[PDB]
Design a protein around this ligand. Sequence first.
Ligand code: KQO
Ligand code: ZN
Ligand code: ZN
Ligand code: ZN
Length: 443
Amino acid sequence: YCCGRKLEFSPQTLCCYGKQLCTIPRDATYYSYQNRYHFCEKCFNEIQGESVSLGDPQTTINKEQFSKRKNDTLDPELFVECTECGRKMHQICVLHHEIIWPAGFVCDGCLKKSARTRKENKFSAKRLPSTRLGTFLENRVNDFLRRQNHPESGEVTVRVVHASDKTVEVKPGMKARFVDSGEMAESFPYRTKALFAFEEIDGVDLCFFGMHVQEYGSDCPPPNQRRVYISYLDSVHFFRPKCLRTAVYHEILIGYLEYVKKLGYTTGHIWACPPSEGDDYIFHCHPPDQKIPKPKRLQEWFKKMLDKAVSERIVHDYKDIFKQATEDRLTSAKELPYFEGDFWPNVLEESIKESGGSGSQKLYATMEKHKEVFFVIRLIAGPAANSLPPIVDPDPLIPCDLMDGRDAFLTLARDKHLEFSSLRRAQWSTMCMLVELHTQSQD
Ligand SMILES: COc1ccc(C2(C(=O)N3C[C@H](F)C[C@@H]3C(=O)Nc3ccc4[nH]ncc4n3)CCCCC2)cc1
Ligand SMILES: [Zn+2]
Ligand SMILES: [Zn+2]
Ligand SMILES: [Zn+2]
């Protein structure tokens, strides 16, 4: 071997299908049917008798048709063979990708000896199509890095890899309360964008940061107009050097707020919510020693980022949702911004049901309960906010199914055994992710 290391992939967490958002973690017992429908033991034993309705229509399958197993299968890492010396090498170690170098793998010893070099990887992060937004962000990050003069830092590339039109539909409880009486729009149009930051470490790209956002333009009816909502943020903690990692995250996030403020978006919204254990927002299979922040520390992290943005004159100010509503003299749930997949649409469904039909009953109490978790970020304030021209985004749409939401990228990593759990594995996953973004765009 190369490293002389016996390497195998770790078992990944699956879903249990018999409960919304349930999972089966490493080294857990589970029941599976056709390697497709998996059940945690609890979700299995809570099924009535021996009849499970399956599908994705209904197919009643008996319970004795399942296999009982433990989630502990260890797939060995793959090797590749040098087409000349026949040396066997971990594919991840040498980062050989059949699509980048179709003519076969040639080890570095055979390359140095013959004074040869690998043909250039034209499937790099750098060569992903650029945008006004991505350029604005990466200029900000690289200018910051060069101001720091740290010998270990590498060039950072920021790329927007998806942009498409969407709408968020008001859920049935709030629909029956406010939409059917005509007090609230039934849906809100927005544009979603996915963007990623890469760092060149030793001429090798590493994806270390990802973001999905929802941008509601000047055409959106209230209460959603001229607002951006950050759907998901994620990172892989291998940015080099470690002591600039947080500042780089801040530069990206503050730069994005600066950018949308320039286009005319008045307000930013952040739900400071950690993932639960074993759940990946964007990047599949995080490093074990990269810890999920607990809520209070995630909140303070966002507070520090926003405070720097305020002192930079980018953010005017920010408040929690409870304080924001009080100053806005809010009286009804219909006045709250209604975002896709956000907490408040879900809690308002439950609030209306438990109150027997009111849409204002526990509103302020619920906002006070959770206020520390919801940031309302004022970008454009006072009289300037009233006379704004239409929002015209210079960047075009970018159709890319792999990056339409977070799910397709998690599925690709699952299907191709990609992990972001170590530097070597995250570099390999970055290479495969880059190849996929380049080939999908070719179509
Ligand atoms: C105080 O400390 C922090 C460490 C990282 C962050 C950020 C961040 O990345 N995250 C916040 C959420 F927590 C999701 C993601 C995260 O930790 N995601 C992880 C991390 C480890 C994981 N293991 N398993 C899953 C899993 N998800 C860094 C990039 C910009 C967003 C804020 C913020 C604070
Ligand atoms: Zn190796
Ligand atoms: Zn379960
Ligand atoms: Zn060789």
